[PDB]
Amino acid sequence: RHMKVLLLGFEFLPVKVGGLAEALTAISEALASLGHEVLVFTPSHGRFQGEEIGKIRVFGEEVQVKVSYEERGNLRIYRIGGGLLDSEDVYGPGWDGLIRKAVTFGRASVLLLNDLLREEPLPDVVHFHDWHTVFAGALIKKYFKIPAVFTIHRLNKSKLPAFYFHEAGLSELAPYPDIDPEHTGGYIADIVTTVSRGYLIDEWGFFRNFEGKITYVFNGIDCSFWNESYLTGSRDERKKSLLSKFGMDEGVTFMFIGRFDRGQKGVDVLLKAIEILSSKKEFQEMRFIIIGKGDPELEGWARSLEEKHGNVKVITEMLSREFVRELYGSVDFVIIPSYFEPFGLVALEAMCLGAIPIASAVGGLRDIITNETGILVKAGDPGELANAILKALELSRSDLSKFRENCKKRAMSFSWEKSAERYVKAYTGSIDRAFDFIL
């Protein structure tokens, strides 16, 4: 039954950059709750000031390794400091520093584990996440010979000069002048995983190289927070109240939240879709809340539509989670026009608070959304999005209470416990995997 897991993560709470830190801490906590002893190795990034445990040679220079320690139940956390690991720029400083930081983290992890084997047994598996932890996972695999699992949360698609592999003591893994560290991590790993079944299919051109040892393991949502119990009144009352705060009157309400960028979150597709619809008679029946920032040309374009249309509103700030929870619980639909999506947490967050997703049929959004829980659409096509929005409006005159209930039931099925239980399977190879010849 019970196992001893070594989890290598390049970021961990309270260090927060993207969504990974939160994701790895949830996995690590969930594993611990199942009764597994979980050890976490992660850089301190200048957040913690630990005790000096030893010295290592890295890039022809001496470096004193420091360690900060926390223990919560079966979870044991180690923040490793020393050299570039004390640099606050989590993914830095610069492309050069980040790679050196990853290499130092690799040799520091071997030092720390080596000291632990002085008083305790070898871990059953080494679970390492993303290309930044590859040097650590490769080194631990190389010397201690324990099973390795590699999880890719998002493909970076970029090669590193052979130089950095030679310095990490992994020369044999660098037979060419440049190496993709995600290909190297998949090569040395026993089982490779990714965060959705759809993303695995979308990026098969790459994942194909690990046919028969590549699988999917879904992330989870904490619908202990994302939940309607924190909201008061009925949905209509909440929706009428929210719209008053925005300075709009009653209408079918659509919501976008995300970065304003190109070929990514698709706010540009949404904006063109609003322009297409603006000539239709049923446009003045629709309400649009667009939240986020980034590309200032897209922010200006977004602010032009707010200026030209009283039923469109834009907010270029990062709102709190409490305020976003109330937004998901008030709006009718959430629009997710992504060009690609590894998982799609925004969908789950909206679905748990009863908002109906209209999303691009890409990556994990295909796995999350179904016929009876939302609308999928062809990605990168404003006309087809505008048409999906028109179809969402006719639905709205019917009782959508069944749609909303199905969303809440489904979203809550994506638990972190289910996610953890399935990693335990991957750790022993007792798991299914992707084969090209299965139809």
Ligand X SMILES: O=C1CO[C@H](CO)[C@@H](O)[C@@H]1O
Residues that bind ligand X (CB under 6 A): 19-20, 23, 153-154, 195, 219, 341-346
Partner interacting with residue 344 (select from its own copies, ligand X, none; CB below 5-8 Å by kind) = ligand X
Partner interacting with residue 435 (select from its own copies, ligand X, none; CB below 5-8 Å by kind) = its own copies
Q: Are 339 and 362 in contact (CB under 8 A)?
A: yes
Closest among 54, 36, 193, 186 to 123, alpha carbons compared: 36
Residue 47 or 142: the one with the smaller Cβ distance to its own copies is 142
> Considering the rule CB under 8 A, would residue 115 count as an interface residue with its own copies?
yes
DSSP-assigned letters across all residues of 176-209: SSEE-HHHHHHHH-SEEEES-HHHHHHTHHHHGG
Closest among 273, 81, 276 to 290, alpha carbons compared: 273
Partner interacting with residue 154 (select from ligand X, its own copies, none; CB below 5-8 Å by kind) = ligand X
Q: Are 343 and 196 in contact (CB under 8 A)?
A: yes
Q: CB neighbours of 253 closer than 8 A, spacing ≥ 6?
A: 239, 242, 243, 286, 287, 288, 289, 330, 331, 332, 333
> How many Å separate Cα 301 from the centre of its chain?
28
Residue 55 or 378: the one with the smaller Cβ distance to its own copies is 55
Number of residues interacting with its own copies: please give it, by CB under 8 A.
Answer: 38
Residue 20 or 312: the one with the smaller Cβ distance to ligand X is 20
- Structure-block tokens of residue 405: 């209930």
Closest among 288, 300, 303 to 337, alpha carbons compared: 288
Q: Which of 122, 209, 230, 259 binds its own copies (CB under 8 A)?
A: 122
> Considering the rule CB under 8 A, would residue 121 count as an interface residue with its own copies?
yes
Residue 20 or 138: the one with the smaller Cβ distance to its own copies is 138
Nearest distance from C-beta of residue 198 to its own copies, angstroms: 18
Closest among 5, 19, 69, 62 to 42, alpha carbons compared: 69
Closest among 216, 228, 197, 195 to 412, alpha carbons compared: 228
Partner interacting with residue 213 (select from its own copies, ligand X, none; CB below 5-8 Å by kind) = its own copies
Q: Which of 36, 79, 127, 213 binds its own copies (CB under 8 A)?
A: 213
Considering only 29-37, 113-121, 275-283, 399-407, which stretch makes contact with its own copies by CB under 8 A?
Answer: 113-121
Find the binding residues for its own copies in span 34-63 (CB under 8 A).
54-58, 62
Residues in contact with its own copies, shown as a per-residue x/- string from 408 to 427 under the rule CB under 8 A: -----------------x--
- Structure-block tokens of residue 299: 């922010």
Considering only 11-19, 141-149, 289-297, 363-371, which stretch makes contact with its own copies by CB under 8 A?
Answer: 141-149
DSSP 8-state class, residue 378: -
> Considering the rule CB under 8 A, would residue 335 count as an interface residue with its own copies?
no
Nearest distance from C-beta of residue 146 to its own copies, angstroms: 8
Q: Which residues of 230-264 are buried (b: 16+ CB within 10 A; e: fewer)?
A: ebeeebeebbeebbeeeebeebbbbbbbbebbeeb
Indicate left, alpha or beta for 73 from its phi (over 0: left) and psi (-120 to 50: alpha): left
Q: Which of 91, 144, 187, 204 binds its own copies (CB under 8 A)?
A: 144
> Considering the rule CB under 8 A, would residue 209 count as an interface residue with its own copies?
no
> Considering the rule CB under 8 A, would residue 93 count as an interface residue with its own copies?
no
Q: Does residue 226 sit in helix, strand or coil?
A: coil
> Considering the rule CB under 8 A, would residue 318 count as an interface residue with its own copies?
no
> Considering the rule CB under 8 A, would residue 6 count as an interface residue with its own copies?
no
Nearest distance from C-beta of residue 201 to ligand X, angstroms: 15
> Considering the rule CB under 8 A, would residue 125 count as an interface residue with its own copies?
no
Considering only 19-27, 104-112, 235-243, 343-351, which stretch makes contact with its own copies by CB under 8 A?
Answer: 104-112
Partner interacting with residue 195 (select from ligand X, its own copies, none; CB below 5-8 Å by kind) = ligand X
> Considering the rule CB under 8 A, would residue 120 count as an interface residue with its own copies?
yes
Residue 138 or 385: the one with the smaller Cβ distance to its own copies is 138
The Cα–Cα gap between 328 and 350 comes to 5
Nearest distance from C-beta of residue 386 to its own copies, angstroms: 37
Q: CB neighbours of 293 closer than 8 A, spacing ≥ 6?
A: 259, 260, 299, 316, 317, 318
> Considering the rule CB under 8 A, would residue 190 count as an interface residue with its own copies?
yes
Residue 332 or 349: the one with the smaller Cβ distance to ligand X is 349
The Cα–Cα gap between 439 and 436 comes to 8
Closest among 435, 429, 426, 422 to 210, alpha carbons compared: 435
Binding-site ranges for its own copies (CB under 8 A): 54-58, 62, 107, 110-111, 114-115, 117-118, 120-122, 142-146, 169, 190, 211-213, 425, 428-433, 435-439
